[PDB]
Design a protein around this nucleic acid. Structure first.
Lengths: 63, 78, 108, 176
RNA sequence: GGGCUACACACGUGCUACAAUGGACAGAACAAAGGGCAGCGAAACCGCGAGGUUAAGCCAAUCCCACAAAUCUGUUCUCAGUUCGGAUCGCAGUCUGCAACUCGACUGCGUGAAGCUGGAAUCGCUAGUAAUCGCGGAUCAGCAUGCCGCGGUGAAUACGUUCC
């Protein structure tokens, strides 16, 4: 590694708003995250909100 | 048309239910454009009068919440 | 930031939430009553509790990409089925039934 | 640190018994990750190269090379030289840290994220992430962002055929 | 049944804005003139709302339409294509009426555009006038930014006839 060229690297304690913590090494010493992988709904299988929401209109006869 | 129901003409309802009591047939020549599409119309090819001709349209699952005269523009343009 | 898109830090909450595609003024006031932020704070000045409640309330609401993709689905629906109202969607002529010898100048 | 241990411990026996190799060395390993930038606005905006010579030093601390055009192009208003695009190559521990940033931290922040494509394999066992917005993992700082200019990531395995690179990158954490 | 509502274009008249003398939210007040019998419709109830159900009173200086609005007073944003503006549009509604698809008005949610005071040219007004704000009525089931009246606040200037 060239000296005086690269920025530093400390042990990043990546957080998440769902409380899940994770560890990398970055420029930032500590990182707070609002949406991680396990918080994002695509990673969590068939998600709650958009997949429960995305039923197309059943020819809305109902009334 | 709010809570009184949807709208159809009685004659077109009569023709379609004669068509639906056995099986589908040829096109229905129908001057009523004002009438909504019930889900019981689907598959019945019907001929809407645009003003000068009878245009045949085949009714699908989507073409329900609209009316018949949405599928026949009356004004030719270019 | 909240729905995958920013809100401005230096506005009040009620109107910083307006810049999210799907929340105007009145859904923002319906949110902040449920959240309890009392409508008089910057969003540069909130707590993680107080903004996390805003986040998951908006996560319950049909906001960010859902709205655009479903409204494109409705427009593509009545374009594809036929449907003179979708013909007006296509050509650049007004949809709701409006005179065209004059202005109609949002659409062409 | 954690993605090497996850890869070795969980993946290498599981992938080795999934593809039934006749030796441990036949198991594909992600060798390098090449991050292309590809900023060609250096012609009309002469300073712009420093954007992502600044940013890609922050994306991974290995400084990218200010890469040059190898041929003069008149249709792009460009002579040979006048350097275009930055380039990071990556192998070691920071790279598994970088996939830890991509998989677990960044790719949620794609503001329209869905299944990123199955059809981004070349036919040899290599993958590319095509990025259009330069702020995905939280270091990028909207404050220091005006031009949204995205990125090309080239995830390069040692896989000889293609669908075993598929079953590698699914197990590393790429969603599809 | 359609069209007179077409639409690449020009072009008269108008409405709304581009904003702090502003926008939003809450409080307080002040009008005139006119309409109502198969019509005006109180109050109560429900609905976020457009409105809805039961129904008092009224052939009317009595009762209703009818809770005037700019205004004034507090709170709030702070000069940006924005807490400006509302076009367009999707969805959900409401009322009228055999029926609102072409082709109705209105509401509710959301999207939010052109526009930051307008080239050549050009119009109106001499006082309760111009500017601005609402109200009313004909027409009419329903449709008003038009028209016809009404009030609310309410100016600037006229040396002069050189010129059109």
């Amino acid at each position: 590694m060239k000296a005086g060229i690269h920025p530093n690297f400390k042990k990043a304690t990546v957080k998440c708003a769902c409380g899940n913590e994770f560890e990398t090494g970055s420029v930032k010493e500590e990182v707070r995250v609002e949406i991680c992988s396990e918080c994002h709904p695509f990673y969590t299988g068939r998600q709650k909100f958009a997949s429960a929401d995305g039923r197309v209109d059943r020819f809305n006869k109902k009334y | 048309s709010l809570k009184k129901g949807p709208f159809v003409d009685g004659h077109l309802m009569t023709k379609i239910e004669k068509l639906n009591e056995t099986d589908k047939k040829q096109v229905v020549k129908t001057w009523s454009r004002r009438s909504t599409i019930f889900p019981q119309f689907i598959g019945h090819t019907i001929a809407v009068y645009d003003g000068r001709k009878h245009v045949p349209v085949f009714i699908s699952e989507d073409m329900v919440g609209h009316k018949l005269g949405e599928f026949a523009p009356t004004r030719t343009y270019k | 930031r909240i729905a995958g898109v920013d809100i401005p830090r230096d506005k009040r909450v009620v109107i910083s939430l307006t810049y999210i595609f799907g929340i105007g003024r009145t859904t923002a006031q319906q949110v902040l009553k449920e959240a309890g932020v009392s409508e008089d704070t910057r969003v540069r000045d909130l707590t993680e509790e107080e903004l996390g409640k805003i986040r998951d309330i908006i996560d319950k609401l049909k906001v960010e990409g859902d709205l655009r993709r479903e409204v494109s689905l409705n427009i593509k629906r009545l374009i594809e089925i036929g449907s003179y109202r979708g013909i007006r969607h296509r050509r650049g002529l007004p949809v709701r039934g409006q005179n065209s010898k004059n202005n109609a100048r949002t659409r062409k | 640190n954690r993605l090497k241990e996850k890869y070795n411990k969980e993946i290498a026996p599981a992938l080795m018994t999934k593809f039934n190799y006749d030796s441990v060395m036949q198991v594909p390993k992600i060798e390098k990750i090449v991050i292309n930038m590809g900023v060609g606005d250096a012609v009309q905006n002469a300073k712009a190269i420093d954007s992502a010579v600044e940013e890609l030093t922050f994306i991974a601390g290995q400084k990218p090379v200010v890469t040059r055009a190898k041929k003069s192009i008149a249709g792009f208003r460009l002579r040979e030289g006048m350097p275009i695009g930055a380039k990071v190559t990556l192998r070691g521990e920071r790279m598994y840290d970088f996939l830890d940033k991509l998989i677990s931290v960044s790719l949620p922040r794609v503001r329209d994220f869905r299944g990123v494509s199955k059809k981004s394999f070349d036919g040899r066992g290599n993958y590319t992430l095509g990025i259009k917005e330069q702020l995905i993992f939280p270091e990028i700082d909207y404050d220091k962002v005006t031009k949204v200019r995205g990125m090309d990531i080239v995830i390069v395995t040692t896989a000889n055929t293609d669908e075993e690179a598929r079953e590698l990158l699914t197990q590393v954490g790429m969603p599809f």
